[PDB]
Amino acid sequence: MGSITENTSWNKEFSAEAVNGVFVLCKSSSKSCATNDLARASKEYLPASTFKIPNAIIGLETGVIKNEHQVFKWDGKPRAMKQWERDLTLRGAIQVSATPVFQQIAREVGEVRMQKYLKKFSYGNQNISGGIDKFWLEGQLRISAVNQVEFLESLYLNKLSASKENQLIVKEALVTEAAPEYLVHSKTGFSGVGTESNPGVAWWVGWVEKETEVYFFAFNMDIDNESKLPLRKSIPTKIMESEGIIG
Amino acid sequence: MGSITENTSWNKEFSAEAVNGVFVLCKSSSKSCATNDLARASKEYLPASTFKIPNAIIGLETGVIKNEHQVFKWDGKPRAMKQWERDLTLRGAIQVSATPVFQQIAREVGEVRMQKYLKKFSYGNQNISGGIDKFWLEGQLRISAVNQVEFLESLYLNKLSASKENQLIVKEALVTEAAPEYLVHSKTGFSGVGTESNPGVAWWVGWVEKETEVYFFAFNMDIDNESKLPLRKSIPTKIMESEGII
Predict the structure, then answer these.
(1) Which of A25, A187, B47, B185 is the most buried (most CB within 10 A)?
(2) Which GO biological process entries does UniProt record here (chain A)?
């Protein structure tokens, strides 16, 4: 990105909900970003399920995921969420956030190739220690809101070190809202509730293609109670609504 | 397509609105399709703006459309709808149905290349006579609901005679509804009102990717009054709702 500035016009959206968090919103045409909290925008957190973005691309690029029509069959063995207990397409697995599918993908990719792609993608601190199938969930991997938007811009432009085909496949799988004037591509994440003193993190990252403009965004917040989870989308949605981008 | 079978259970969605039309619905593949009207399923009509699908693919394949991020700049000269009087992306031009953008694409593609691609795509009667920039609007080109679903299935499978990249670009541009369990890719069309004796045609074609299944669809209807236009979506939507698809 070309620039970043701190603003205060979004602060009310956080204070109204007693949330400690950050929103970063970048306009493609001007390469300029705005945030409510410059310091927090550079702080690095567990990606949790936002990692499904690079993991999907790496899965495709290595051939672990055959193509965009791959179905990930459920083996009948119980999963942590009922919604995960079914056959899933790539978009399906991303949209219900079926972590076990992606844990199997990561295992097949393996440490050497995973390390290589995270370096190529400049993905956070690029630290995959903690187990090949959990580094992004409970391990050492950390990424900032600024880094999320940088990464997403590269994906949008097909500038990642992967085939254009594979970037396109992932981009379509990430579509979460379609309107005649805009398309939203996005992914949520949630590390857990942590403790009161050491809270978890929740994310919502993505981009909005709106007329001929493109807006890259990354939201994160501290979370110590699962009841607060919907705020990860409502706060940034309200901000982007008040900016006239969506809604 | 393998076989097409009559399903009389959707008739009420048509009769309730006094509409003469056809819906063609195919689960998984065009091996077996269902319809309310065997004869009309294969009757060929002007594609109107449903032609924006092959035209976009051909524009990309020929390099007339440079890439996925091409902006079609408005020259500031009057266009037939105010919503077309602005710079547009490829998805934008498709979604608002900006005919003049696609007319210019067609002119640049040219007759020889256009004919070649419609033959490759098996697109309707492949008749491009009536002027390079209006054959799908008022010319001799005709396509049926069955042929639309065949063509859309090929696109979905990346099996058209075009790069996989170009087919993926057009597929994303066609996304019109996103839900956690389903994605709808679709395009409307409307030839005009014609006359009570010789009505125009309205279309809605596309596919729904639901759970691990895919459903290809094509709807058309006779239309002589623009008031009836929303029926081109509401009738097939009601049918697909009652099938449990959307």
Answers:
(1) B47
(2) antibiotic catabolic process; cell wall organization; response to antibiotic
